[PDB]
Design a protein around this ligand. Structure first.
Ligand SMILES: Nc1ncnc2c1ncn2[C@@H]1O[C@H](COP(=O)(O)OP(=O)(O)O)[C@@H](O)[C@H]1O
Ligand SMILES: Nc1ncnc2c1ncn2[C@@H]1O[C@H](COP(=O)(O)OP(=O)(O)O)[C@@H](O)[C@H]1O
Lengths: 730, 730
């Protein structure tokens, strides 16, 4: 409930939505960036009354650099998982598909954030039919002319009010002091600050983060108070607010300063993968820690400082509470840009400006880090060359093929390249000079034809992370990854057939921690003997090769003492019944996360999982577990999160003793579940619960469980209210 | 000498060039389009005094849609034939290469036609160094601000004057009446017209063509006189002059109207290949002739009407006088556009306008013929679909690769496609749905990976012309081209291994006329037995397989009675001496054109060629003939043109009886020629003569021959003055 002073505005907006015309209706929210337009939209999205009243709730991100085809793909992905048929149809075809998808449903609302030009609104409006079902469009805009120019915009342009003072002091106190009370010698400074921010929440949260970072001293509070007083916030000039961000930026440590500045190289509206980005922090040497925690731990700590300062906003978190997807505010992105080019020339972006001509070698040679986001193919066709370029950064929501003749240009022009992520570029093959980059550390790309990883990859002695994505069924690795001592991580989407190591000095790879998806045949004794420090393991392929009762290779997994994350993917031609678990003591004594996919195991097998006393997060995906009768056997003494998706389970019996400490519980696509155990509502730690494609009997059992737990909350000191998801509410 | 009234302007421009500053100097020529800027530039280029004074003379075409990399490639192609090393270097690298290439030479001039914006001039000027050698730049522009903005443009902007009336009447009379005298009842109309064109040569030539097309009657002359009087030519509004072109356009026949309008679909500044374009018409059914001449003959007649009306201007002609490269004036191109979209909606062009968004299906479905010239890859990535599209037209000076996943989009979106020329698009493979186009007639594309022509190509029963270009050494054709009765032409750049026909109805392909270079092993008896009407033959590969004395296959060529054009390319691993011709009577009795490449034959072999009494044009390319002593044996009773390039010939003896009727004579890269026969100057028909990379002894022999022939011209009635090329004059 981190929303202060928006209750009246949200209530009046909701009143506008539920009332008004009975046909199509669009409400525009205009305001100076950072004032709370998207935050208010998110509050409206999560409000219970509107969600109950609206059958379908879609969140859409537009941004300035919107792609209509990409946007239509994004909307289509929210309806049908089988997206292979929609990749070929032209844009109006997916527009009609969206039209009929929302036609099949009931009353719906569409949320369009950060629309910059009226022509974009006109081009996207064609996908929303007028079915006289009181469908609503929550449009957010920076300019009132966008709403004014539309004849169909019958609703008056709602100018969202700026934050009131009563909201100010309370908001800033909640942000910076949390549950603490401000000392008297800082209270007047806080009030003066709140009056001096001119009710702009982004400025308030950024100065709160700055105050947290340095210390809660009266002198520093007076300094920031006079600084914000020296910067009057004009209602028509947002750039001065960037100066306030400067008052935060100077307070960060030099390496942390640098990583925050590098965080701005990403495109606006881009949902950053957390794991990818921590790798960018590590590969570039930005993360330096002379302490007991690992470098990845230090990078996670830095991300935690970023989020708690409200500099980087997290949109989706992992099931266990970790950060999954983070992004930067568009105003903060513009400030980071302005700093990057006009102030400290750390890195530069190459964009198709009004001149429509790309920079030549003379200007490019002065760059140190590049970031090409659109029209990359033309730029690489120009064949640039940078002798002082240390990085190549490029993310796009669309995949761009790699011209073969143009392939050798990138390595030849950048011999001093260190990191090179082209995950939006589909490499067709490997060039010889690509193999000459001895200074490379991070390489990640996609391919649709590469089957054999060549031997010469072993001669890159400075690579730290290697990420490969492909649509091929099986991937063969011929390069000697075992002698690559500095290699730390691997991530693959296909079945990776690692070479069988040969036994010959400290050849043991103590730095290798995570190695993503590996074919079952490579999970041998020698492979795990060379990496005792492995923590995350992933197996992809015919799991029957792993888990035959007579010659199961999981005995080798027993000797891996440092393992905590295991992933198994079943790609066998036949995935029928007959699979069973080995004795429970075979597993590592300190494993934490295991995920079973397409295993087709009997329910009783969790008894093996019942022996592990430290299991806390478990995920079942794509027919991990099934069986008509599920009886809870054994006690999961430390289970916190269990995640089951698309199982034909019918009946489940459970008790509080079986799962004494569960916190997160998820069922998805359970088309045959009869009832959820009532006694689960008797567990105090049971907090969050969700349904998807469940039976009506499951729905009424869920409602009864919610009522019982709410009554228990009325009985005991259950501070954390129960969370139930009525999805879909149709 | 078709230049009237420009003698004074050309003389003063030449005086400016030879005089002025001793360093870099740029003369700009500004004027309303069609006034004669490029024509005056061409006259200056071909003037003898400037060519003698200037060591290096380069012609450069810029146009509005100029590409700096393409332009630099074009300039580099004029210096070194080995262009494989220059394809990889970045733009400034070829700029420096051009800098040193002109540095090695002496005083030079660079001609830049049709420069539209000053920034283009600034970006191209960096390739021209200041060596204090009085180098000159003939720049042609439409706006004086382009010259004014340049600080280095010390020379005053020369505003070229409009043609005077005395030149006018003479110019129009030379254009329309040639050597005839205007009747008195049309002379006053001609004078009134010439005064009413306001001295604009393009208008004069177009109305002369219109008058020629309809008839030289007094009433029609009065009609065109009042029409041009009704259209006053404003000096600042060129669009009204387009109306005058209308007075010509309405006078053409409907099919000829249509083909002229289709001629405008090509990009401005594009040098049209004549053969391709007659193929494009013959495929679209535009050429209809109910007469004895072939359809190709009718198309050539139409092109002749186009050129003699000055609607289409020819830049380079074939050695025998035929049209090789033709183009349209930029003002005429704009008029053709205006007519195409705003008037008769015959065809439309898809371009990246200020909106920066490509048309959708709704507008595209109303189109009948398309023409995409730039940013084609984005358009095909959009995946357009046209149910009423009958043609797909795309030429570019650069090669664009074909995305595999995007490959199927083109055929699926255009099932009613008839012609499809993507010769600027590099196809990587064949898609199955591409093979579903049963309405296709003309297909032409380039590839760097296609080795096997698939069988299903035989199921396209409506194909008339098939053109394939590839860099592969050998091309295999598996499709049954023999049962393709409507197929008329084939053109390949690689060795084409045709399938061996099997003997089984009129299966004989009487419509097949030309079939490009074909691998030697396919020149069998059965192949030539199925196409008795063949006229142009081409063989590419190991010619030793064709021409072994014991088992030569040219006996089969004997039975081909309709053959007139033969091409042979030697791609054998060893091309050493030992090759010899068969007896002369083996050849068809009516052959006209033969070309020998890399044959390595003895000189005496022309005795066989001496037997053919109707040989008129012969070309020797890439070591066709060699030998220290060349003695002329036999009499070429009808030889007109002989063409020899890069031979190590030393001594040649010839007489007038050997070549009694030669007209065009060419020697290129003769690094060892001792002397040219003096008696060749005694031949009356000897008119044109050229040298390239010749010896100094060859140069002085050439000068003596020129002096002797000029003295003979002073003796006899040699109306056609002798033409000698001082090339290079360094
Ligand atoms: N009621 C509120 N309580 C706390 N923070 C808020 C509130 N409204 C806005 N904010 C903060 O203001 C910032 C700007 O939010 P957002 O609406 O996403 O951008 P914009 O206002 O430009 O659309 C957010 O980071 C958010 O944390
Ligand atoms: N002195 C001349 N004699 C005959 N025709 C001319 C003369 N000068 C120009 N023309 C004609 O005028 C037309 C325009 O010529 P050009 O110079 O190529 O275009 P622009 O004047 O727009 O540069 C040409 O087709 C040419 O035939």
């Amino acid at each position: 409930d981190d929303v202060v002073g928006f209750e009246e505005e949200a209530d009046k907006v909701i009143n506008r939505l539920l009332g008004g015309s009975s046909g199509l209706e669009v409400v525009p929210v205009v305001g100076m960036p950072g004032l709370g337009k998207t935050t208010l939209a998110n509050k409206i999205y999560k409000h219970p009354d509107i969600g109950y009243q609206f059958f379908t709730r879609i969140w859409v991100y537009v941004s300035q650099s919107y792609r209509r085809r990409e946007l239509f793909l994004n909307i289509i992905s929210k309806f049908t998982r089988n997206t292979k048929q929609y990749h070929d149809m032209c844009e109006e075809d997916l527009a009609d598909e969206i039209e009929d998808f929302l036609g099949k449903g009931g009353k719906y609302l569409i949320v369009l954030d950060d629309v910059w030009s009226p022509d974009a609104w006109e081009r996207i409006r064609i996908a929303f039919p007028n079915n006289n079902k009181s469908n609503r469009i929550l449009l957010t805009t920076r300019d009132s002319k966008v709403a004014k120019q539309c004849k169909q915009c019958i609703g008056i342009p709602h100018d969202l009010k700026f934050l009131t003072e009563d909201e100010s002091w309370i908001l800033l106190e909640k942000k910076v002091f949390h549950k603490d009370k401000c000392p008297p010698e800082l209270e007047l400074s806080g009030k003066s600050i709140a009056k001096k921010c001119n009710g702009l929440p982004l400025a308030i949260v950024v100065i709160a983060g700055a105050l947290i970072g340095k210390g809660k001293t009266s002198r520093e509070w007076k300094q920031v108070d006079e600084s914000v007083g020296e910067h009057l916030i004009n209602k028509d000039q947002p750039e001065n607010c960037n100066k306030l961000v400067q008052l935060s930026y100077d307070r960060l440590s030099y390496d942390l300063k640098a990583c925050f500045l590098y965080c701005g190289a990403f495109p606006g509206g881009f949902e950053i993968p957390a794991w990818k980005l921590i790798r960018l922090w590590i590969a570039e040497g930005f993360i330096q820690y002379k302490g007991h925690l690992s470098l990845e731990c230090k990078a996670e700590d830095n991300l935690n400082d970023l989020i708690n300062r409200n500099l980087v906003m997290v949109m989706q978190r992992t099931s266990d509470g970790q950060i999954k997807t983070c992004r930067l505010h568009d105003m903060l992105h513009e400030f980071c840009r302005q700093e990057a080019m006009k102030e400290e020339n750390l890195f530069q972006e190459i964009k198709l400006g009004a001149e429509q001509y790309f920079p030549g070698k003379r200007e490019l040679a002065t760059y140190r880090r590049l970031c090409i986001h659109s029209s990359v193919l033309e730029f690489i066709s120009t064949k640039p060359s940078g002798e002082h370029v240390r990085s190549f950064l490029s993310f796009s929501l669309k995949k761009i093929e790699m011209p073969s003749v143009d392939i050798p240009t990138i390595p030849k022009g950048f011999p001093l390249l260190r990191v090179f992520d082209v995950e939006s570029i589909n490499f067709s093959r490997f060039s010889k000079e690509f193999f000459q980059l001895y200074h490379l550390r991070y390489i990640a790309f996609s391919s649709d034809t590469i089957k054999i990883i060549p031997k010469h990859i072993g001669e890159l002695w400075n690579i730290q992370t290697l990420i490969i994505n492909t649509q091929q069924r099986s991937l063969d690795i011929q390069a000697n990854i075992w002698n690559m001592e500095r290699l730390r991580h691997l991530h693959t989407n296909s079945s990776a057939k690692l070479p069988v190591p040969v036994t010959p000095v400290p050849l043991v790879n103590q730095s290798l921690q995570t190695l993503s998806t590996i074919a079952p045949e490579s999970c041998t004794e020698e492979v795990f003997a060379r990496t005792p420090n492995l923590k995350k393991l992933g197996i992809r392929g015919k799991i029957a090769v792993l888990l035959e009762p007579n010659k199961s290779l999981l005995k080798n997994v027993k000797k891996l003492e440092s393992l905590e994350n295991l992933k198994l993917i079943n790609d066998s031609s036949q995935t029928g019944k007959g699979l069973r678990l080995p004795p429970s003591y075979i597993f590592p004594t300190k494993l934490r996360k295991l995920s079973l996919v397409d295993t087709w195991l009997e329910w009783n097998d969790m008894s093996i999982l019942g022996q592990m006393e430290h299991l806390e997060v478990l995920k079942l995906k794509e027919n991990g577990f099934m069986g008509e009768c599920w009886e809870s056997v054994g006690g999961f003494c430390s289970l916190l999160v269990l995640w089951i998706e698309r199982t034909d389970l019918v009946s489940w019996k459970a008790s509080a003793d079986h799962f004494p400490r569960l916190k997160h519980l998820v069922l998805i696509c359970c088309d045959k579940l009869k009832e959820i155990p009532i006694g689960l509502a008797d567990i105090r730690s049971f907090q969050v619960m969700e349904l998807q494609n469940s039976t009506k009997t499951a729905a009424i059992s869920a409602r009864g469980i919610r009522d019982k737990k709410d009554k228990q909350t009325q009985e005991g000191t259950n501070n954390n209210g129960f969370k139930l998801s009525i999805f879909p509410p149709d």
